[PDB]
């Protein structure tokens with residue numbers, strides 16, 4: 001570790017901890033920047049040499065973390081919990097958590113290599129056609145197939161091809177990662193890595209609180225599921241759709257069946273009302289990636305939040321490179337921890353759902369811009385779910401028919417009950433369909449980290465959860481050679497997921513509060529906070545707090561409640577919740593999937609007829 005980056009000496013008291021945190025911040029920003037920059041160079045240009053440099057940067061970060069972590073525990077282990085300065089407690093508490101820096105050097109190198117290799121496998125996996133040369137990438141190729149194809153056999157080829165190509169090679173690496181991760185965090189005092197991940201929410205009742213939320217939300221999902229299953233039955237037939245069983249997992253518009261907005265055209269209750277999927281208009285009008293990011297930016301500035309700085313436009317990767325070089329296409333927003341460089345890396349496609357993704361990612365950037373002057377350790381969301389909700393909340397306003405009209409994406413304006421059902425159904429396909437998936441992913445991973453799910457049951461327990469919560473089934477047979485959890489980005493890239501369940505609840509609490517602050521006095525689902533500087537100032541207070549204060553208190557200040565609450569989501573959706581319940585009763589639907597063992601047959605002449 002460079003001498004200038006090494007911890008000096010400080011008193012064993014709070015006043016020494018304060019000087020300790022300032023000296024830490026100085027060197028931490030440099031160590032973080034080199035690490036983030038190395039990751040950027042790799043993720044925008046996947047090569048063996050760039051992976052080598054990223055692993056070296058990661059090792060330097062662990063060296064820094066160990067030196068300052070062990071100094072913090074040498075001086076302040078018994079006194080940090082009683083500091084008068086609450087923010088200093090939070091800084092010290094972070095510095096003393098060593099994580100992977102607890103591993104001996106050889107195991108640190110093994111850990112870093114596993115992360116690099118798992119990331120490379122996921123982001124370079126291809127589905128090749130039997131033209132053995134011609135191969136499809138996840139983004140854009142397979143994504144577009146899952147979204148736009150209505151051929152059962154083609155969707156099956158993409159789904160199976162992807163899950164086999166990405167998942168199978170990941171499994172042995174993921175087992176080794178799990179063990180090393182647990183070994184590291186057990187030395188921080190946690191029973192397993194999942195216990196450390198859950199500790200970020202600082203709630204002893206976290207898992208019970210989540211379960212109580214899901215109980216309130218499940219009836220909405222069950223009714224949406226049944227309605228969509230009926231629509232799929234009308235298209236695909238009784239051979240491929242069981243009206244009393246799970247839905248085949250490749251028919252819902254998305255590789256993970258996690259959002260169903262891409263099948264809206266098949267389920268739209270009132271098709272002679274305005275077409276709320278504006279993708280065709282974006283195409284017809286010549287929208288490009290840069291337009292989408294500028295439109296998102298202008299929403300933020302309309303609230304008197306910050307525009308994207310020049311460094312963002314100069315540094316960001318907003319389209320998949322055409323030079324063919326391999327990149328991580330999965331969208332992400334980057335803080336370089338130097339208070340200057342902030343970037344998005346997105347293989348942007350011109351679609352309405354991608355416009356939502358742009359807002360999501362710009363939400364992350366806006367957070368970074370607002371807390372850039374806090375101590376580096378507090379440059380975080382109040383909890384990780386706050387960070388995920390910011391851009392989604394703005395996108396709730398952007399997607400309203402009234403707002404789409406303002407930005408020239410929807411000429412026809414209507415305010416009637418049928419148009420409301422259409423819109424709320426489209427929003428339910430995006431938001432309510434996700435809830436079971438957002439809930440289940442880390443239930444699977446918590447079980448893996450705790451040892452309840454050993455490698456011999458990775459796929460068994462994955463599909464148990466997928467059927468239990470989402471009510472879907474794999475469209476081809478799977479066994480424990482398959483590792484279908486690994487075919488979802490966040491698993492090999494070791495990104496926790498419960499934040500997204502939290503953020504899908506929170507964003508409606510936020511929306512309700514901002515709409516009220518904006519002076520809006522109509523239905524919650526028609527609110528548009530565009531150009532509300534009052535709403536912007538309330539949101540700005542959250543963003544500037546970072547993780548300096550307990551999230552329960554930040555939430556109370558914003559929305560008047562100190563807890564996650566499903567009521568605002570329920571209130572947003574109430575008209576379509578009622579409508580879907582009535583429609584399923586009239587149609588005699590069975591809610592749920594009592595034929596839990598059912599799987600669709602293979603197409604005749606599959607995969608042979610894929611050409």
Ligand SMILES: *[C@@H]1O[C@H](CO[C@@H]2O[C@@H](C)[C@@H](O)[C@@H](O)[C@@H]2O)[C@@H](O[C@@H]2O[C@H](CO)[C@@H](O[C@@H]3O[C@H](CO)[C@@H](O)[C@H](O)[C@@H]3O)[C@H](O)[C@H]2NC(C)=O)[C@H](O)[C@H]1NC(C)=O
Nearest residue numbers: 400401402403414415416520521522523524525526527528
């Ligand atoms: C779409 O239309 C709805 C419904 O509009 C209402 O019902 C129609 C059948 C007609 O009779 C309309 O004349 C009638 O307004 C609109 O929602 C409604 O908005 C109004 C105005 O913001 C709300 O009235 C306000 O109520 C608050 C108290 O809640 C008072 O303080 C205000 O002074 C004002 O009277 C009304 O409550 C609201 N209705 C519901 C059920 O929420 C909606 O604004 C409109 N949307 C668009 C984009 O035009």
Ligand SMILES: CCCC[C@H](N[C@@H](CCc1ccccc1)C(=O)O)C(=O)N[C@@H](Cc1ccc(O)cc1)C(=O)O
Nearest residue numbers: 258330331332333356357360361364388392493495500
């Ligand atoms: C719309 C955003 C899609 C892209 C997003 N990308 C991650 C990168 C996280 C990351 C962390 C550390 C290193 C690298 C990446 C991020 O921005 O959170 C993502 O995955 N969202 C979830 C979940 C989700 C789905 C719909 C939403 O409206 C919001 C969230 C999903 O699509 O499954």
Ligand SMILES: *[C@@H]1O[C@H](CO[C@@H]2O[C@@H](C)[C@@H](O)[C@@H](O)[C@@H]2O)[C@@H](O)[C@H](O)[C@H]1NC(C)=O
Nearest residue numbers: 160164474475476477478479480481482602
């Ligand atoms: C796991 O499955 C692999 C792929 O074949 C699968 O099972 C057959 C019966 C078909 O249903 C097919 O659609 C499935 O994808 C096998 O090659 C492999 O041997 C199996 N692994 C073990 C350990 O048995």
Ligand SMILES: *[C@@H]1O[C@H](CO)[C@@H](O)[C@H](O)[C@H]1NC(C)=O
Nearest residue numbers: 045046047048049050323325
């Ligand atoms: C990709 O990385 C290599 C080093 O592995 C470098 O020589 C090359 O210039 C990079 N390409 C781009 C476009 O940055």
Ligand SMILES: [Cl-]
Nearest residue numbers: 384496498499
């Ligand atoms: Cl999280």
Ligand SMILES: [Mg+2]
Nearest residue numbers: 147262351353
């Ligand atoms: Mg779409």
Ligand SMILES: [Zn+2]
Nearest residue numbers: 360364387388
């Ligand atoms: Zn995010």
